Design a protein around this ligand. Structure first.
Ligand SMILES: NC(=O)C1=CN([C@@H]2O[C@H](COP(=O)(O)OP(=O)(O)OC[C@H]3O[C@@H](n4cnc5c(N)ncnc54)[C@H](OP(=O)(O)O)[C@@H]3O)[C@@H](O)[C@H]2O)C=CC1
Ligand code: SF4
Ligand code: SF4
Ligand code: SF4
Ligand code: FES
Ligand SMILES: [Zn+2]
Lengths: 123, 123, 74, 117, 68, 82, 47, 693, 57
């Protein structure tokens, strides 16, 4: 038959927000635990704490989503991303998409006020 | 109104700093056919810096706006508004204009004039 | 969207009286309007400098001695 | 010959390569860039290059101006630009040109000029 | 292979039975310009330099001051 | 005000009736009382009665004229002018 | 080259995509067609 | 009353006496047509619109057949299909094989209806070939290719009935019938370009536009014309960075589906003489400069100059949008100045009709109000130049109902009969006390149309006094169902300028400025600028003010921004940006925001939403788009603004003169247009091409 | 194989800038610009083919 792969979870839409909260915290634990494996697979310059910080920021972004269906989709996609990272299916190039700040300073001029944005036609 | 923005995978700038227009195509002044005027188009307003510029090698028109050629079709103004809200898009509705009806009679070309003719109709 | 992180403004005047208008957002298809010659561009420092310049679409003229050695710059 | 650049330096170009075509000195359309402007705006990519090898097609406007007017008896000349030697349909769509007005009248497709007589 | 003149190029690929020197006059092209054959100049100072045949679509104002 | 006064009011709204009366009857009195101010009256359907005043160097202040009488309209106006 | 890796960036096109669907016909092209329903699957008319 | 008929089985109810094609359109049935058009007299010459009617034995022309109760019509019979094929066969037999070279290709009703209703192949292989036709020269705007003409007579009906230009017609007979002027005459009318839209085929085409684009490659944007104050709704067709052409779209309450020739052909002024980089005067020459350099130079000139109060003068030109005017006024007020002026003569002083109520400077009868007119008095106004499509509207009303029109002012070449009452204010006094005053008293829908050019006179109050007294008397002219008092603005920005109160204070008109900011202001003279003054010009074209300037700032044109414009009606309309601005030019309100930050007085909105907010703060009607609402204050306004303050004004003895010398060049864009210059020479009155006798 | 633009036997260009090639091109490889030639002819001022976009169909 056609069997599932490493760290594959069948898609199940949780009927309750608490039963989803359990699964979500388990996924967060999985990510935090895989951080050192990630740093080894993807030959990263930065530290393991930086990876774990990034993971926290990712999970933080959806801290206030209310609709159960949306949380279900966010969870299923987050698990897909975990499976992609832990199996080394990603290359370094796509993994480093998650760490834009880790790259060096892009230049002297990142405008913040109106006048600087207006001088670069970005007002 | 479900915030499907956060599940689509589109860039955040699309639901933050872009405006769309929802309208019906006007009856073209060059033709008598009205076949393209019933759909509700949704398309993006242009961005000044990124819209179009001349390439210095061969003269092609470059662009930085990935939405510049995209146009959605909807069967009703309400469907379009619903979709735009579901994507978190700021929109403007341009209400369509229609030809005011009047009665036209061929015989009116020959009505007897009791005083001085205001103009010579020629046919 | 990309940006011209190297440029302070969009219209620039060179000391020689040339008017340069930057076109585009700042990516590969954009042009700053500047033209630069980098002597020794195929070397250790020059390759980084050429990468940074060409990234925002300033025209880079590279004088070279041996052909095969400069190919990566393209 | 000498074209002044935006830098303020001089570009030298042989006279013959400043001609828009070998058979014509000047542009034949308002939007057409002249050779001088092309060199002024693209000189970087012309350095260490041989101009004599670049494509230099003949301007068709002078060539068609060299063709004699065809004189026709009636009010209407017919043109199709056909190739009487080959098979198939090798000309342009067949059109009819009114020659009642004074002077010659050009085929919209091929530029051949007709005149009443 | 780019040094082979057109016509002969077709003949060498068994495109036509009869060779260019044997082709009757009626089946030759009339030219009002001089014919010149040039091979591939790639990797050579004679390589084709492309360019925009249009001047820019928007023309700027030539600045002129006036006295008040 | 010192320089500008703007009256926003509805044309058909009931909440704007005291404002409409105030304009219609005492607009000339107000204009003569403040000869250098620039007074504008602007009407639109959905808007709530309001008055803006512009004093100097662009500083502006506003008060809403959802009121009962013309007397009280002029009271709110005079208060804002102070 | 600075990073020695394949990088992802916001899209920029040397020639913008040209969408020619603006030239679609102003006249309805085909019409209604015909119905091929069998007579045993049409509601009867009274009398 | 409405009667009822059936079309293709459907039930449709339509007003009695309406044509069958109208009922077909109402019932959602498509009927092919060439000669019929909703805005022209019925012709019935193309024969494409045939249908079957059970009473009729042979197929009837739908466009000319009156509907009757109980009528049964079939548009889908085999006879009708056959007739459509027969007519298309006859139409195509002499039509030239021109589609590859014809500008109509791809937006052609002949092509499309051949595809939809005709044979797939022709039968005409005659060895004597086709008929050919001479080409005809009717001026620099409309190129002719008369082989393509299918003799629908739309151009003739439009030129005769709608524009009042009878030089066009059909000569000869039978196969040799030709559309033209029978001898070399220009099609001389400000409405002429509309025939290009009306011609179903490529017989009449846009000459400046020829061969430059095909319809499938054009981005289409619905926007607003700013060549006059009517606010015609338009479609701008652009490709990439440049605007290719301007076409009307339908707004039955504004321009209905027409535009004038300036609105159509001055677009080529947008690709030449453009302002692309900041300029700084150094000696007698401009030098290109950065935005930072130019803004800093403005700031340093402000610090040095040190204007107190009303020494900072702001001037707004004919083309500017409302957001830009609002930002300029807010910055000017934050500088301590009340010297916000308009660009017109005597615009240093306030207008004599006042600014307090909108109904004192607007077309209070809507544009559509002209349809109801029974008597019109024109006072110092030539509508044919000031508002061409409104002039066409007046002509249509005049042609279809009895209506009396009189004017005080310069003799005008009119497309309708006018009664000249004299060129002076004394003539106006006599008229309003005489027979035409009685005409106005007796009428059901009178309106008095006052030109924006009278406002620009010193004696303006006198006129506004006279009219005002008359209006305050005659109930037919001003009552709760009808306001017949009308001011006709000529410039697209004036109504909005008055809306935000872009008007000088009384003490400001005394002062001599040390710093002048011109916002699209190209009507300014040498006299209007002090020599010691530091002049900033902000615009999109280099015409006049830029020549006067010390610092020049490139701003966006109307096709490059989504601006608000208020037309003569008080209608607030919103445009859409087709392209972005060229080079280093900028959206104008952002220019003002940046320069105010350089000046200390940094404005409180840096976003488009915040600017629209601020606009709603100034006037709630600026954000209520495409809406016209009447004033409840109609009686108060006339007394308070026209009759009240204007008693002291003494009338001059100078006659009223024409407001606009040349229709074809009025603003910076039109004066930058090669087409407008060519047309100005071509259509001059002293040229025999423009003279019927 | 490789593209070419042809002439009439007189030497006049055959292309009259109808832009049908540009419309049909499945790869959008053709870019065309036109206007009226100083002799009145309908002719191209720009005809470009991106041979690296072309599919040689
Ligand atoms: N790396 C370091 O630690 C330091 C370097 N520098 C200086 O930085 C500059 C470049 O540094 P780096 O990249 O490391 O050096 P590289 O050797 O890598 O590159 C030097 C460049 O100079 C060219 N060069 C050397 N001689 C000639 C010559 N006769 N004619 C033409 N070109 C020549 C080389 O061209 P080609 O490849 O054809 O030989 C090469 O491209 C040098 O001037 C160096 O002195 C000074 C302080 C620190
Ligand atoms: S008018 Fe229409 S059918 Fe006739 S040549 Fe032009 S595009 Fe073709
Ligand atoms: S020129 Fe055009 S509009 Fe006029 S009759 Fe001929 S086809 Fe009709
Ligand atoms: S534009 Fe293309 S299709 Fe039209 S004539 Fe020229 S080459 Fe042929
Ligand atoms: S549209 Fe009816 S005959 Fe022409
Ligand atoms: Zn021909």
């Amino acid at each position: 038959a056609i069997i599932a792969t490493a760290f594959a979870e069948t898609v199940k839409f949780s009927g309750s927000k608490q039963e989803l909260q359990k699964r979500t915290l388990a996924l967060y634990r999985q990510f935090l635990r895989g951080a050192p494996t990630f740093a080894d697979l993807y030959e990263v310059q930065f530290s393991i704490p930086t990876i774990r910080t990034k993971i926290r920021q990712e999970f933080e972004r959806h801290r206030f989503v209310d609709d159960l269906s949306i949380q279900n989709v966010l969870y299923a996609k987050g698990h897909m991303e975990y499976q992609e990272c832990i199996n080394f299916w990603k290359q370094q190039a796509q993994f480093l998409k998650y760490f834009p700040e880790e790259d060096d300073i892009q230049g002297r001029h990142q405008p913040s006020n109106f006048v600087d944005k207006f001088l670069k036609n970005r007002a | 109104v479900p915030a499907h923005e956060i599940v689509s995978g589109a860039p955040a700038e699309l639901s933050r700093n872009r405006v769309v227009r929802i309208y019906q195509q006007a009856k073209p002044a060059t033709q008598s056919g009205e076949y393209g005027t019933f759909a509700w188009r949704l398309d993006w307003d242009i961005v000044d810096v990124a819209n179009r510029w001349e390439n210095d090698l061969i003269g092609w028109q470059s662009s930085g706006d990935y939405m510049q050629a995209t146009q959605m079709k909807f069967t009703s103004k309400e469907s379009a508004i619903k979709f735009a809200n579901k994507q978190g898009w700021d929109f403007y509705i341009q209400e369509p204009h229609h030809r005011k009806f009047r009665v036209k009679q061929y015989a009116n070309n020959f009505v007897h004039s009791y005083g001085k003719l205001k103009h010579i109709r020629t046919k | 969207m990309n940006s011209f992180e190297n440029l302070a403004q969009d219209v620039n005047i060179t000391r020689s009286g040339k008017t340069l208008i930057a076109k585009g957002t700042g990516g590969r298809s954009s042009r700053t309007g500047y033209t630069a010659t980098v002597f020794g561009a195929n070397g250790f420092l020059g390759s980084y400098l050429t990468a940074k310049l060409a990234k925002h679409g300033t025209t880079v003229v590279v004088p070279y001695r041996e052909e095969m050695a400069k190919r990566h710059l393209k | 010959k000498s074209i002044i650049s935006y830098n303020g330096n001089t570009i030298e170009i042989p006279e013959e390569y400043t001609k828009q075509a070998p058979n014509r000195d000047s542009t034949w359309a308002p939007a057409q860039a002249s050779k001088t402007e092309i060199y002024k705006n693209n000189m970087v990519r012309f350095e260490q290059k041989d101009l004599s090898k670049q494509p230099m097609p003949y301007a068709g406007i002078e060539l068609i101006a060299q063709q004699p007017v065809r004189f026709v008896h009636g009010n209407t000349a017919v043109c199709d630009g056909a190739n009487h030697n080959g098979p198939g349909a090798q000309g342009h769509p067949k059109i009819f040109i009114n020659v009642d007005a004074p002077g010659s009248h050009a085929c919209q497709y091929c530029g051949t000029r007709y005149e009443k007589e | 292979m780019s040094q082979v003149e057109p016509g002969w190029h077709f003949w060498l690929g068994y495109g036509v039975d009869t060779a260019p020197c044997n082709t009757p006059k009626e089946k030759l092209p009339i030219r009002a310009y001089p014919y010149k054959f040039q091979p591939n100049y790639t990797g050579t100072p004679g390589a084709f330099v492309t360019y925009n045949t249009l001047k820019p679509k928007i023309s700027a104002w030539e600045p002129v001051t006036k006295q008040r | 005000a010192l320089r500008e006064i703007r009256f926003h009011l509805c044309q058909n709204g009931s909440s704007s009736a005291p404002l409409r009366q105030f304009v219609k009857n005492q607009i000339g009195a107000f204009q003569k009382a403040n000869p250098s101010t620039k007074v504008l009256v602007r009407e639109a359907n959905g808007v709530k009665p309001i008055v803006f005043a512009r004093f100097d160097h662009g500083h502006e202040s506003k008060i809403g004229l959802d009121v009962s009488s013309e007397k009280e309209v002029a009271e709110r106006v005079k208060s804002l002018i102070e | 080259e600075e990073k020695r890796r394949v990088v992802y960036e916001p899209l920029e096109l040397t020639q913008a995509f040209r969408n020619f669907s603006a030239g679609s016909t102003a006249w309805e092209p085909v019409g209604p067609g015909r119905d091929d329903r069998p007579d045993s699957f049409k509601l009867p008319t009274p009398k | 009353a409405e009667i009822e008929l059936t079309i293709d089985g459907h039930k449709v109810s339509i007003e009695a006496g309406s044509a069958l094609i109208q009922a077909c359109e109402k019932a959602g049935v498509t009927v092919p047509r060439y000669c019929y058009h909703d805005k022209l007299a019925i012709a019935g010459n193309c024969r494409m619109c045939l249908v079957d009617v059970e009473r009729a034995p042979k197929p009837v022309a739908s466009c000319a057949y009156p509907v009757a109760p109980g009528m049964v019509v079939r548009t889908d019979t085999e006879r009708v299909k056959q007739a459509r094929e027969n007519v298309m066969e006859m139409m195509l037999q002499n039509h030239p094989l021109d589609c590859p070279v014809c500008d109509q290709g791809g937006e052609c009703d002949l092509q499309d209806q051949s595809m939809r209703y005709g044979r797939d192949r022709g039968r005409f292989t005659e060895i004597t070939g086709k008929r050919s036709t001479e080409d005809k020269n009717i001026g620099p705007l409309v190129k002719t290719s008369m082989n393509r003409c299918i003799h629908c007579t739309r151009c003739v009906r439009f030129a005769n009935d709608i524009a009042g230009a009878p030089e066009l017609g059909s000569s000869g007979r039978g196969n040799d019938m030709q559309i033209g002027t029978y001898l070399e005459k220009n099609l001389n009318t400000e409405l002429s370009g509309n025939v290009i839209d009306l011609c179903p085929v490529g017989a009449l085409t846009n000459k400046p536009y020829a061969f430059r684009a095909r319809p499938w490659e054009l981005k289409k944007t619905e926007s607003i014309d700013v060549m006059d104050a009517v606010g015609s709704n338009i479609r701008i067709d652009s490709k990439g960075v440049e605007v290719m052409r301007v076409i009307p779209r339908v707004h039955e309450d504004v321009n209905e589906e027409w535009i004038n020739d300036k609105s159509r052909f001055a677009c080529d002024g947008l690709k030449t003489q453009r302002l692309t980089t900041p300029l700084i005067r150094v000696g007698d020459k401009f030098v290109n400069a950065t935005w930072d350099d130019a803004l800093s130079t403005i700031a340093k000139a402000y610090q040095q100059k040190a204007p107190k109060g009303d020494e900072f003068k702001a001037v707004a030109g004919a083309l500017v949008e409302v957001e830009s005017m609002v930002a300029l006024k807010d910055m000017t007020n934050a500088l301590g100045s009340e010297n916000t002026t308009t660009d017109t003569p005597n615009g240093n002083s306030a207008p004599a009709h006042g600014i307090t109520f909108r109904s004192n400077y607007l077309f209070n009868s809507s544009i559509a109000g002209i349809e109801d007119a029974d008597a019109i008095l024109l006072v110092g106004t030539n509508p044919r130049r000031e508002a061409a499509v409104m002039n066409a509207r007046i002509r249509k009303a005049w042609l279809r109902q009895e209506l009396e029109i009189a004017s005080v002012g310069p003799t005008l070449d009119a497309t309708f009969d006018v009664a000249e009452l004299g060129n002076t204010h004394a003539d106006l006094e006599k008229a309003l006390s005489g027979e035409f005053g009685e005409v106005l008293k007796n009428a059901k829908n009178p309106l008095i149309i006052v030109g924006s050019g009278i406002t620009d006179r010193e004696d303006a109050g006198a006129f506004f006094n006279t009219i005002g007294k008359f209006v305050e008397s005659t109930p037919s002219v001003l009552n709760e169902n009808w306001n017949g008092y009308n001011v006709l603005q000529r410039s697209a920005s004036r109504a909005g300028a008055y809306d935000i109160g872009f008007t000088p204070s009384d003490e400001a008109s005394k002062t001599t400025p040390k710093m002048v900011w011109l916002l699209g202001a190209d009507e300014v003279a040498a006299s209007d600028i002090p020599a010691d003054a530091f002049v900033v010009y902000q615009g999109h074209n280099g015409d006049v003010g830029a020549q006067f300037a010390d610092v020049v700032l490139p701003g966006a044109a109307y096709t490059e921004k989504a601006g608000t414009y208020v037309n003569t009606e008080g209608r607030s309309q919103i445009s859409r940006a087709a392209t972005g601005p060229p080079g280093g030019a900028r959206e104008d309100w952002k220019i003002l925001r940046a320069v105010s930050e350089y000046l200390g007085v940094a404005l409180p909105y840096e976003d488009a939403y915040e600017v629209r907010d601020r606009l709603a703060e100034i006037s709630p009607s600026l954000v209520r788009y495409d809406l016209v609402e009447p004033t409840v204050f109609g009686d108060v306004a006339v007394q308070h603004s026209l009759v009240g303050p204007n008693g002291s004004v003494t009338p001059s003895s100078a006659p009223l003169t024409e407001t606009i010398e040349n229709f074809y060049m009025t603003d910076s864009i039109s004066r930058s247009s090669p087409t407008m210059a060519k047309s100005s020479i071509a259509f001059n009155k002293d040229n025999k091409k423009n003279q019927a006798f | 194989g490789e593209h070419a633009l042809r002439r009439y036997p007189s030497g006049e260009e055959r292309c009259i800038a109808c832009k049908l090639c540009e419309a049909i091109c499945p790869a959008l490889a053709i870019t065309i610009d036109a206007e009226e030639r100083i002799d009145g002819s309908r002719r191209t001022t720009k005809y470009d083919i991106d041979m690296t976009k072309c599919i040689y169909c």
